[PDB]
Amino acid sequence: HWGYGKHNGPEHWHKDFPIAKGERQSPVDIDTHTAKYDPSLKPLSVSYDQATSLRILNNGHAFNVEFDDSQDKAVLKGGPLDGTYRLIQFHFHWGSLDGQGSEHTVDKKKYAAELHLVHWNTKYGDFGKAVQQPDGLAVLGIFLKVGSAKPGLQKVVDVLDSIKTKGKSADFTNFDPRGLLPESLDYWTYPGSLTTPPLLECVTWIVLKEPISVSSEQVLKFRKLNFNGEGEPEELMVDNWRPAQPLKNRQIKASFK
Ligand SMILES: NS(=O)(=O)c1ccc(O)c(NC(=O)NCCc2ccccn2)c1
Ligand SMILES: [Zn+2]
């Protein structure tokens, strides 16, 4: 099964998922100088006031905080998007060291981690149908750098001991994802893919310019999770990031100058 180890990591994924060598794969390096400012890009609309988190799950490749997406409770609109996209889950990718961990890079710079808030286009009715469409998902990507703590992340950090191993889930209600957002919603955007198998080319990527800062203790607790299931040999869940993929025939647009 695919993973991030020596024999099943990202360079192996194309054998099971040939779209890995596709024309709109993610993540990518964001060359800030080559990104073009687009004045027709609208500001992003993040409407998270009514979000209903339900639980948190270790799926063996990251942990997902899952939301009730059966109504327009937490939605993303505006920006490059047409229509309304509902938040279904968020998760992170992170490194074994503070110097790596993000999937997107900015002028080749790697951040300590990257948060992905995953949304699906309501015109397709549910997530499973949306991922089959070229405009099915909008993923809001937010970089994490190590510095001061992010208070809004602590409730996530504190529950991770209850989902250490693959397959464990925990009730995780009343979590407000607004506590994970930076001050500015300036963004880059490009058409891309899921960054884990099945690598489907269904994502409008919206990557925020401004990182959030989290503490060293906060990211250290991510690194205590396990890829393995309980009662299997312990392999720390670290470096669960795919490296940058060829931009090919794509242009990254910026909402700011
Ligand atoms: N890392 S990412 O590009 O934000 C992202 C977002 C939503 C996703 O469903 C995935 N991929 C993922 O979760 N793979 C395991 C479950 C899955 C997801 C989609 C279709 C089939 N199976 C990646
Ligand atoms: Zn992701």
Swiss-Prot record:
Result, substituting V139G: Weakly impaired activity
Reported effect, A62S: 2-fold decrease in enzyme efficiency, as determined by kcat/KM ratio, and efficiently inhibited by chlorzolamide
Keyword Zinc-finger among UniProt keywords: no
Impact reported for V139H: Impaired activity
PANTHER family linked: CARBONIC ANHYDRASE (PTHR18952), CARBONIC ANHYDRASE 2 (PTHR18952:SF120)
Organism the protein comes from: Homo sapiens
Active-site residues, Swiss-Prot/TrEMBL: H61
GO cellular component entries: apical part of cell; cytoplasm; cytosol; extracellular exosome; myelin sheath; plasma membrane
Subunit structure: Interacts with SLC4A4. Interaction with SLC4A7 regulates SLC4A7 transporter activity. Interacts with SLC26A6 isoform 4 (via C-terminus cytoplasmic domain).
Designated name of the protein: Carbonic anhydrase 2
Known outcome of mutating T196H: Higher affinity for bicarbonate. Enhanced proton transfer capacity
Role noted for this protein: Catalyzes the reversible hydration of carbon dioxide. Can also hydrate cyanamide to urea. Stimulates the chloride-bicarbonate exchange activity of SLC26A6. Essential for bone resorption and osteoclast differentiation. Involved in the regulation of fluid secretion into the anterior chamber of the eye. Contributes to intracellular pH regulation in the duodenal upper villous epithelium during proton-coupled peptide absorption.
UniProt record similarity statement: Belongs to the alpha-carbonic anhydrase family.
Localization: Cytoplasm; Cell membrane
Note on cofactor: Zinc. Can also use cobalt(II) with lower efficiency, but not copper(II), nickel(II) and manganese(II).
pH dependence (UniProt free text): Optimum pH is 6-8.
GO MF, one annotated term: arylesterase activity
Result when mutating K15E: In Jogjakarta
Phenotype upon changing E103 to A/Q: Strongly reduced CO(2) hydrase activity
Entry's disease: Osteopetrosis, autosomal recessive 3: A rare genetic disease characterized by abnormally dense bone, due to defective resorption of immature bone. Osteopetrosis occurs in two forms: a severe autosomal recessive form occurring in utero, infancy, or childhood, and a benign autosomal dominant form occurring in adolescence or adulthood. Recessive osteopetrosis commonly manifests in early infancy with macrocephaly, feeding difficulties, evolving blindness and deafness, bone marrow failure, severe anemia, and hepatosplenomegaly.
Effect recorded for H116E: Strongly reduced activity
Effect of Y4H: Reduced proton transfer rate
Residue positions, PTM Phosphoserine: S162, S169
Binding site for Zn(2+): H91, H93, H116
Cofactor(s) recorded in Swiss-Prot or TrEMBL: Zn(2+); Co(2+)
